[PDB]
């Protein structure tokens, strides 16, 4: 912030529209408004330069036809250089440019949830709907309702 204030532009905004359909790009608008009631976290998938998670998803993630309905589990967001944020929201526990990022219901990216099915030196990196779907069908049960943070924080008794 310098002096003026910004809120929204509403006009140009691209997203997951060449891989599956409506999944990791539903948008924070519908994802947040709904993430409040039902209470579901988001999966901000970001990809910059070349990007393989977008090309591989096209032929296979195109299978997300079922993932189009599975979204009832939660909602994600896909951004690119067009709206590249200025924080870990694009790359937390890594240096790539940009990869998949799971975050808390509200839009708070955190290196807490990655792609366990990914490579052993990338994690967040995605290259197949098969994995993003297991991480979808999984985190959707634990990541939602703070059911991922082990269990409790304290008690003493």
Swiss-Prot record:
The gene is TXNDC12. One of its GO terms (cellular component) is endoplasmic reticulum lumen. Protein-disulfide reductase of the endoplasmic reticulum that promotes disulfide bond formation in client proteins through its thiol-disulfide oxidase activity. Optimum pH is 6.5. PANTHER family: ANTERIOR GRADIENT PROTEIN-RELATED, THIOREDOXIN DOMAIN-CONTAINING PROTEIN 12. Widely expressed. It comes from Homo sapiens (Human). One of its GO terms (biological process) is negative regulation of endoplasmic reticulum stress-induced intrinsic apoptotic signaling pathway. It catalyses: [protein]-disulfide + 2 glutathione = [protein]-dithiol + glutathione disulfide. Its EC number is 1.8.4.2. One of its GO terms (molecular function) is protein-disulfide reductase activity. Keywords: Disulfide bond, Endoplasmic reticulum, Oxidoreductase, Redox-active center, Signal. Disulfide bonds join 51-54. Pfam families: Thioredoxin_7. Transmembrane segments: none annotated. This is Thioredoxin domain-containing protein 12.
